[PDB]
C-alpha cells in the first residue's frame, strides 16, 4: 500500500491524473455553461 500510493504520486501518474481531472472539469463546465464568449456577471 505505501508503495502503491508512492507509485500513484509519481510524475507520470499524478500528472496524467491531474490533467484528466482538469480536463473533466472544463468539460463539465462547458457542458452546463456552454457557448460563453464573455464574462457576463
Amino acid at each position: 500500500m505505501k508503495d502503491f500510493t508512492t507509485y500513484l504520486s509519481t510524475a507520470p501518474v499524478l500528472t496524467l491524473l491531474s490533467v484528466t481531472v482538469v480536463a473533466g472539469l472544463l468539460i463539465e463546465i462547458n457542458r452546463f455553461f456552454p457557448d460563453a464568449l464573455i464574462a457576463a456577471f
Binding site: 504520486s9 510524475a11 464573455i38 464574462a39
Partner: protein, 165 residues
C-alpha cells in the same frame, strides 16, 4: 457603438446569420422521424444554437459589417461603453488563476528545495504537501505583494550565476 459597430441585437446581418444556420439544421432534420435518436439530437442542437444567438444578443456584443461579435481590449474605452466583460474582466480572471498556479508551484519548489533529496521530490511529488500549497496559493496577490514589499520574493544578482560576458 464604440467604433462603427452596431450592437448585435440591432445588426441585421447577425439575425440573418442566426436564420441561415438554423435553416441548415432544419434541412438536416427533414430526414428522420421526429422521435428517433438522430431527430432528438438535431432538435437539441437547434435549441442550443437558438439559445446561443439569443444570449449573444442579450449581452450586447458588437457586430461588424459581417454578423460576428467583436471584442474591446482597452480599459476605459470599454468601461465607459459597457464592454468590460470582453477583455478586462477575463484579464483579471486569468491573471488571478495563472498567478495561483504559478505561486503554488513556486512555493512547492521552495518547500522541497530544503530537504534531503530535492532532485527526488520533483519526480515523486509529495501529494499532501502539493495539495496544501495548492490551497494556500489562492491568496497569491496578497502573499506576493507582501514578499515584494519585503524584498524576499526576488534574489540579488550578486548571488545568481552568470555567463563569462
Amino acid at each position: 457603438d464604440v467604433a462603427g459597430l452596431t450592437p448585435c441585437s440591432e445588426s441585421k446581418a447577425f439575425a440573418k446569420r442566426k436564420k441561415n444556420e438554423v435553416k441548415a439544421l432544419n434541412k438536416r432534420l427533414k430526414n428522420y422521424e421526429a422521435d428517433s435518436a438522430p431527430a432528438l439530437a438535431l432538435k437539441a442542437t437547434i435549441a442550443r444554437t437558438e439559445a446561443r444567438f439569443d444570449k449573444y444578443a442579450k449581452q450586447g456584443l458588437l457586430c461588424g459589417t459581417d454578423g460576428l461579435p467583436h471584442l474591446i481590449a482597452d480599459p476605459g474605452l470599454a468601461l465607459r461603453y459597457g464592454h468590460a466583460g470582453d477583455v478586462f474582466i477575463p484579464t483579471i480572471g486569468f491573471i488571478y488563476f495563472a498567478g495561483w498556479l504559478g505561486y503554488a508551484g513556486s512555493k512547492y519548489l521552495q518547500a522541497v528545495a530544503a530537504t534531503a533529496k530535492p532532485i527526488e521530490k520533483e519526480i515523486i511529488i509529495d501529494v499532501p504537501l502539493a495539495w496544501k500549497l495548492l490551497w494556500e496559493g489562492f491568496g497569491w496577490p496578497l502573499r506576493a505583494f507582501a514578499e515584494y514589499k519585503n524584498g524576499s520574493l526576488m534574489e540579488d544578482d550578486a548571488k545568481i550565476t552568470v555567463s563569462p560576458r
